[PDB]
Amino acid sequence: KSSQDYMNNELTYGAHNYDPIPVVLKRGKGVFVYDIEDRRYYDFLSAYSSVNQGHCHPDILNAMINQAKKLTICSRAFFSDSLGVCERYLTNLFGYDKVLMMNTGAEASETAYKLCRKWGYEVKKIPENSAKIIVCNNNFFVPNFLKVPYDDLEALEKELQDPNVCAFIVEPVQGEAGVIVPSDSYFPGVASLCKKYNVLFVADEVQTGLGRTGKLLCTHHYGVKPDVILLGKALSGGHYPISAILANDDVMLVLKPGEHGSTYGGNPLAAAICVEALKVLINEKLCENADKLGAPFLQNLKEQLKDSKVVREVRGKGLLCAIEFKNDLVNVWDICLKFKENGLITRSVHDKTVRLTPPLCITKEQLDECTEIIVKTVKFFDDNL
């Protein structure tokens, strides 16, 4: 069959709740994916950083098969051997007392909200049912969520005044908003306003962490250490849904042994995959590679596109990059379709921004080729407006 047989098939038997680019993948390896007709593309989404280590990494697969032969799941009604090995590994690596393993990024957010509010009541003695969490505006009305603009220390402290605030949950760079990088001063001041007003400084590193911006934690760029870290995506090198919350004893122990719905969270298979996925990231110096290739690539891109009419701005840090377009001049869906035609696949957030986030095992020669591709694709829309 053809790519078109697959797409019609999904249209008949699957819900229509997603709107994918019309490409049908059957294989991935490192920085490349391959469609039904055996065309090859650079993957510039990386499944939103799940494959920082590259597609189908053999070491991760190996750790997977090994654990899967032994035991894939017992519930949280019992202990497994693998979970605690993972927990010890992660806490030591990142320097936190404790970790809580879950499946999805959404689970990690929701559990973080609960953790923050419960620390609010137990430790900060906030009045009942009124613990407030501060989040940023465009990225991360809804009750007891106070919204402030990103990268605005003034508006933040203004909200920290409220004694009922238990936490500020924030991304080191805003992903969904279109890759918004903060001013260098911001986070050093976030750490201060938070330490000052006795507020949990929670860093959402589900996308930004694990090498994406050059470091294990993007916050390490700003030389701050958050009270609470959220991790996900690359935790598994894409082989399994895994997420985690890291925190010290004073916050984590606020959670009590309770009766929770059944889960895959903390299962033995995920635990083994997670350790190996981070070992691969580290042993292969993938954070370093992204830290080296990143800024050059971004600057070189900013240079070659400086005269483009349709480009509004090139943004990024490490290999977390994006191009924002003037959506009054071009349709961004069409830009993505053109990238695809040109051998590079990615997707647009909102109406304006295209994500540029390749697996971190990419070589400089490959990034040069991808630069050609990006320039040629933008050129097309410039030549034809």
Add this chain to the structure above:
Amino acid sequence: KSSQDYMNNELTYGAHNYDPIPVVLKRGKGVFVYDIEDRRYYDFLSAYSSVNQGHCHPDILNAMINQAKKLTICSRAFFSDSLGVCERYLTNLFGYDKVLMMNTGAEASETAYKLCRKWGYEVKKIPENSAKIIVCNNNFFVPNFLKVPYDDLEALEKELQDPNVCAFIVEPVQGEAGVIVPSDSYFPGVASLCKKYNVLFVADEVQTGLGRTGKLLCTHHYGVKPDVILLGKALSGGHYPISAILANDDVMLVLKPGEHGSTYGGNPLAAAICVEALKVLINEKLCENADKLGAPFLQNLKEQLKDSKVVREVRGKGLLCAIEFKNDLVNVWDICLKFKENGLITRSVHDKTVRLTPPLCITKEQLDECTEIIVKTVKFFDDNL
């Protein structure tokens, strides 16, 4: 490294949000698990029906390795080949137009709420922001839910009167409430009251389906066909978090292509695992085995415990079984600890009920042994009051 060592390690590095029975598993295979000290136990939880096919089923592992070598994840920004194969397979199997793949049971519930309400507004023309969902009381306050007692057709129709009701979401047997089986009349009448008042009849089969009670869908016992089915757990034979919603075009097409958050949902690896996990269930006649061994086991158990002072009731259907205890006479945690000591592991829900749900590949000789174990365990407590 002793079990004790594993448990202390988890206590130091992991959150204390769960309260497991003190057994540390390192291996599972079919109906058995094995701890650090190589003791063997019958698994009578089955990770809440995730391992209906038994632990570490080699066919499922095989389908997993095969797909994992090719591609584990691209996001929903693109198409994969594997997803549509899975969707076609499931819709045909269960007889619904469409399916929507997700990761967790909780995701399936939340998505079901949105699906129901959106059908409420689009099709049933319910006024905005006021679509109401009927759930049952002990098992499944909050905005836009209406709670009725389980197995009560009167209280149900009373609530169906409200024109703003879009759906009734209900379990074929109540799990969390302690395995509550409905009167044979109930579901045939649920199907009627629902068809009559123009209300979505949504069956939550996340625990009850896929052979657990003898059939692919427990509702098949009552000869009704729900408008919407929720599936999970055994969908993957415990190798991966997978859940699904099945529904026909008139309901499913209510969800439109959108900018949804990054997901593992519908990833190629889950899709391949899911098809094979159901193939194994069906090729091995696991539904049939549970349908055969189930009632005998339950009746024989009801008989051998008829004179017990601590036992309140034996309940079940197929291999979805439970013993409720008089919590005024015994501590149910201690009962579980004693089961463990006796070679069978399980857990208690609430203060009263112990879950009895072995993998469905269990043999009659095995169930006879387990019967001895359950009787001897209950004997221990009886001999002491």
